[PDB]
């Protein structure tokens, strides 16, 4: 067993973390007070779930997580919520005034004064690890803390834990659930200084989750609770291989090996199904084929883009529930004859499959219905570069007028960091087109 530490940064990073760990306890049968009656190795153990939970002599199962926010309102909730007892106070870190949606303020100004403290709280969790694998960092692109302090942490972690993998879960900004105008700036600033430090990052476009909630869950005005409950399901599907007995994606290193052939092209697309509303009278359960085919509908992807016009470098099917390999291959063969799935020449045309018999766990009182089988497809498509195109375009429109730039210069950032970061994104978009186009 090898532990994984999660780091939740900013509002979106912390509220999503609160949704994942809620689900982790339900899937592993851990109670809100940290008790896990199923673990017969009281006081410890080297089981698969221990990769995410430490154990105390009292039998409490404590998440291996650190919550970081430059403002206390969002983490105070976790200090008085249902699972308040899961975390000890040292695990929750809060400042007093936030980054004001200003990347520079989060990276330079406020980040400088709190960087060495977060790293010291992390060291306290790593000391409890007999064999640390790496980190999963949750954050948003848009916020001043999620973008600005995260990149600062990623640079520091690479220095203090060189041989350790670092996966990201990043929230791509969507105007429909955002009131900040400068998020394109922040999104690009953080991707520039974090890119060399991230080994694999799963982007989630809030626009994608927002429509899945309105379309599949019949939620007129989706709240952050609606969004984070769904996002945690996808996260749970992606992290299941590290928390359960199995052979696919057993450790963080296996993600970059199976999904990232090129270091810079490390942004896999995620597709999840089925998403069924609990308010339905009663749904006709979908078959292995029906849900496998759904992984190629753009309406189920965590980012809207057309993989028919990109090329695949890797494809990974993660099933949960009543699923046997025979039906998987049957659905796959049917989809190849009907779908346009183009792999890059220097890659094999194949799929890695993972099957976990326990079907997806639903949160009581949530919006998702209990289903007999679900799947999450992880595909490294060059089609995800469409997200960088949109992001870079909005950046260019504003930067041509230097709109809002003075807010960043005022925090100590040089204007050159803008164009420096933008040139990098230009190189990223070129790297994608080199791979997926002829």
């Amino acid at each position: 067993m090898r532990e994984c530490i999660s780091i939740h940064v900013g509002q979106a990073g912390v509220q999503i973390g609160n949704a994942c760990w809620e689900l982790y306890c339900l899937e592993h049968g851990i109670q809100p007070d940290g008790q896990m009656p199923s673990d017969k190795t009281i006081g410890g153990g080297d089981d698969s779930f221990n990769t995410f939970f430490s154990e105390t002599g009292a039998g409490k199962h404590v998440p291996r997580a650190v919550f970081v926010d430059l403002e206390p309102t969002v983490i105070d909730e976790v200090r008085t919520g249902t699972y308040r007892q899961l975390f000890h106070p040292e695990q929750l870190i809060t400042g007093k005034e936030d980054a004001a949606n200003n990347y520079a303020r989060g990276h330079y100004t406020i980040g400088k004064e709190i960087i060495d403290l977060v790293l010291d709280r992390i060291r306290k969790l790593a000391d409890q690890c007999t064999g640390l694998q790496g980190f999963l960092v949750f954050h948003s692109f848009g916020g001043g803390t999620g973008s600005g302090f995260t990149s600062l942490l990623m640079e520091r972690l690479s220095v203090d834990y060189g041989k350790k993998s670092k996966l990201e879960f990043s929230i791509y900004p969507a105007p429909q659930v955002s009131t900040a105008v400068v998020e394109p700036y922040n999104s690009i600033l953080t991707t520039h200084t974090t890119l060399e430090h991230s080994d694999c990052a799963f982007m989630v476009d809030n626009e994608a989750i927002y429509d899945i909630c309105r379309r599949n869950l019949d939620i007129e005005r989706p709240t952050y609770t609606n969004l984070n409950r769904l996002i945690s399901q996808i996260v749970s599907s992606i992290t299941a291989s590290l928390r359960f007995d199995g052979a696919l994606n057993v450790d963080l290193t296996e993600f970059q090996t199976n999904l990232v052939p090129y270091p810079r092209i490390h942004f896999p697309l995620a597709t999840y199904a089925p998403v069924i509303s609990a308010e339905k009278a009663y749904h006709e359960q979908l078959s292995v084929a029906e849900i496998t085919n759904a992984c190629f509908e753009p309406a189920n992807q965590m980012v809207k883009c057309d993989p028919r016009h990109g090329k695949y470098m890797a494809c990974c099917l993660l099933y949960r529930g009543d699923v046997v390999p025979k039906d998987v291959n049957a659905a796959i063969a049917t989809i190849k004859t009907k779908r346009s799935i183009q792999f890059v020449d220097w890659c094999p045309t194949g799929f890695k499959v993972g099957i976990n018999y326990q079907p997806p766990t639903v949160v009581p009182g949530g919006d998702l219905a209990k289903v007999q089988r679900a799947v999450c497809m992880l595909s490294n498509t060059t089609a995800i570069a469409e997200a960088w195109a949109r992001l870079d375009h909005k950046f260019d429109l504003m930067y041509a007028k230097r709109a809002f730039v003075h807010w960043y210069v005022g925090e100590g950032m040089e204007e050159g960091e803008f164009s420096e970061a933008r040139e990098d994104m230009a190189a990223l978009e070129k790297d994608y087109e080199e791979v997926g186009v002829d």
Binding site: K96, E97, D98, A100, N101, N102, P175, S178, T179, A180, V181, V182, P184, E220, R221, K394, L397, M398, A400, K401, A403, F404, H406, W407
Partner: protein, 423 residues
């Protein structure tokens, strides 16, 4: 725990400031004696943004009342909520400013500013994390205009990293009959341009036309003008006073793309005088809120372009239909929004409506059409200054003419600056 220190200076500053505390006090369930008697926890969740908590569960506004003459402030202390303000926080002189910016900024005001700053320092020293300050004042008189800007320049020296936000009443020949007004306004605009982060332009010209044309008030009074300022001030601060998504610096980061262009056009719907029975539909809130007749800057937005816009809807209403109507105004008049600032229109919804309204809407616009406001003042200013008329009132207090030329140039540059982004 993001506290705001409120300052109101001068006749207009205190009369409008007093109404503000009266209005929001009613929304947060605080009575004239500071005791809480509300029924919604949502009233107290962000109450400490503008109020302090005293023994016995008393809520005392975090407000400093400043004037150079006791006249107006005795009115406040004898007003409805007069007994709610902190007694010490009353700082006043005995000479007045005689509608003379110089007297407020250099002579009569300097004799008093240090004591006003001892109260500011006292109030800030009790804040866990101070957002910044907000000032209510007029620009046409002597105290709010002259001493108000002196307070800003000194506060900014003592709290250089805190946000400065002002509600500033622009003078109109339709409300005031004092000839020196353009002089006092031009001098003040020079200061605001340099030393404030956000300034709401409350044009008495617009307030007058609304009361006379729309509301049909034949003989508008300041009570009628300040009814519209109350509703607007309540509207623009809703994001700060109730649990929403909120921060003075965050508002600024999204409203102000260029440091000098921090003058907002406020708007409100429905415009009402002191007989609202019929429910106002969401489409009605949106049309009025964006129509010029509901603007409070006396600038036809169709003459300029919106750099950023922010809308606040209050009450229990279809949040889905709000998006529809809002996106309909943009996609039906996107020629009035700059295209080089994506998604520059943002909207929030609050569930607690103002008193006596099923639902209202507040409009916060950073429009380049605000230049018409500054052009108006500049025309009036230069008409007198080219003849050096009425300068002796000012040169007698130690000012030179060059100081007028500089304030004139700073404002005409501001107009030129607004005009370039409009193309």
């Amino acid at each position: 725990m993001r506290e705001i220190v409120h300052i109101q200076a001068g006749q207009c500053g205190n009369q409008i400031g007093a109404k503000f505390w009266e209005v929001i006090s009613d929304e947060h369930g605080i009575d004239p004696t500071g005791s809480y008697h509300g029924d919604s926890d949502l009233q107290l969740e962000r109450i400490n943004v503008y109020y302090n908590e005293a023994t016995g569960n008393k809520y005392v506004p975090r407000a400093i009342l400043v004037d150079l003459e006791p006249g107006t402030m005795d009115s406040v202390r004898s007003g409805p909520f007069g007994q709610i303000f902190r007694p010490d926080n009353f700082v006043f002189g005995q000479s007045g400013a005689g509608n003379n910016w110089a007297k407020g900024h250099y002579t009569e005001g300097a004799e008093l500013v240090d004591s006003v700053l001892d109260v500011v320092r006292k109030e800030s020293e009790s804040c866990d994390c101070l957002q910044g300050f907000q000032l209510t004042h007029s620009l046409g008189g002597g105290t709010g205009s002259g001493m108000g800007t002196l307070l800003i320049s000194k506060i900014r020296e003592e709290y250089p990293d805190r946000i400065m936000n002002t509600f500033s009443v622009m003078p109109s020949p339709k409300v005031s009959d004092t000839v020196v007004e353009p002089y006092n306004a031009t001098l003040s605009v020079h200061q605001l341009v340099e030393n404030t982060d956000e300034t709401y332009c409350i044009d008495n010209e617009a307030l007058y036309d609304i009361c006379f044309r729309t509301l049909k008030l034949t003989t508008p009074t300041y009570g009628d003008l300040n009814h519209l300022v109350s509703a607007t001030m309540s509207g623009v601060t809703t994001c700060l006073r109730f649990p929403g998504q909120a921060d003075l610096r965050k508002l600024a980061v999204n409203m102000v793309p260029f440091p000098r262009l921090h003058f907002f056009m406020p708007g409100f719907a429905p415009l009402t005088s002191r007989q609202q029975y019929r429910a106002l539909t969401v489409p009605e809130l949106t049309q009025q809120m964006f129509d010029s007749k509901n603007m409070m800057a006396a600038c036809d937005p169709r003459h300029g372009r919106y750099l950023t816009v922010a809308a606040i809807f209050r009450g229990r209403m279809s949040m889905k239909e709000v998006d529809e109507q809002m996106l309909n105004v943009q996609n039906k008049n996107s020629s009035y929004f700059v295209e080089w600032i994506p998604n520059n229109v943002k909207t929030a919804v609050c569930d607690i409506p103002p008193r006596g309204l099923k639902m209202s809407a507040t409009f916060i616009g950073n429009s380049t059409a605000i230049q018409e406001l500054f052009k108006r003042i500049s025309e009036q200013f230069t008409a007198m200054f080219r003849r050096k008329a009425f300068l002796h009132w000012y040169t007698g207090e130690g000012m030179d003419e060059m100081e007028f030329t500089e304030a004139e140039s700073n404002m005409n540059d501001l107009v030129s600056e607004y005009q370039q982004y409009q193309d």
